[PDB]
Amino acid sequence: MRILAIDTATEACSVALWNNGTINAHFELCPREHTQRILPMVQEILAASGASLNEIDALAFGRGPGSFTGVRIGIGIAQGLALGANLPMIGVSTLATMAQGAWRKTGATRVLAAIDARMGEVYWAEYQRDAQGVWQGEETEAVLKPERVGERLKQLSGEWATVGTGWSAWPDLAKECGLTLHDGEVSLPAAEDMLPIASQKLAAGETVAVEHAEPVYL
Template identity: 55%
Template sequence: MTSKILAVDTATENCSVALKIGNDTIVRCEMAPREHTVKILPMVDSVLAEAGVTLRELDALAFGRGPGSFTGVRIGIGIAQGLAFGADIPMVGISTMAAMAQQAYRRNQSTQVLSAIDARMNEIYFGGYQRLDNGDWETVHAEAVLPPEMLAAQLSENAAISAENAWAIAGTGWPAYPDLASQLHLSVTESGVLYPESEDMLILAHHALLRGEVVDAEHASPVYLRDTVAWKKLPGRE
């Protein structure tokens, strides 16, 4: 099955778009912490124009569903919904942390990855992933938001994350808490991955398509992990 998939992500400081058609991948990626709304649509237009295709010719539109910045996740899903609805194509939500695991594999051939994003408020978003033989990824530690000092205890209770194996670490959570990795009693290696990129969402979206895990635009939803806190921080909310 050859899929034509567009992926967009604005969940973190990084803003990225990628288009997969056959064996060709076209990528636009730029660090733009406060310019996502300005950058993302021109990026989409650019990759479509380079490929010579329209949105209606695509099989799906993948989007970074989070976790990440509350505002960034909302921007990404809102723009993706508008594009998918207008073109009448299905959507696929992709974990930003699973995308970082795939990026670690793309860069370093890492097959076991611990992803952590700095969630502010003395917390991290965390998830553990293991690559399968078919190129998809299995979640071996459920995605969660937690204080970094609680991570070692959680991992010690997870038999799937063994100290006998080497684990690559990815995401902004590790440099935000420089002593965190050494507290885990695991063999860890640096992956060089800090932010998710849409290019790495394409392979995950491909496997999701094969499993039929698509939704109509009006049913696409984000994953905040800490949505109740973010909601309370909005003006006028208790």
């Protein structure tokens, strides 16, 4: 089947289409104005793989956390796209997406995701890929102050890969914790990494109707 993923949760916007494993994706840093770029990206990606919106089985959307406005804009477009085509929707975490990206690029299986939320906050998550490739640790997603993150890091063990803008925003985090951290090579989520996660949810039937697609509230 086919899965179309869309992400506009952060400073970047991206689209990806999954077709029996074969991926078609596009990623670009999105200005303070995302909306104007999604639709064209979507139509390009669909055309590239010779697919119609009505031929897609599910539409994966970025449920955040991240930009309050950006996350909601993306969900809005996604719903529009899914409603007009009667498509089931799949919410995917921005933090989990970056973790999958770390696995894709560096083979990391334990990811500490930290997003530099404005005004001194950070969106945090501790993700660990299990044997079936499902990222465990969604219950750890939270919005914390740098200080509490530093506190959290002292309770962790084993090695981890770091992903997200939060690390460069608060360089003391990786420095003061006694953990062995590796660079996940992921600063921002990419729709292409949303696909593997959306597919596993589809396989389990964890989808939502258009009217129930919403942003995560941490």
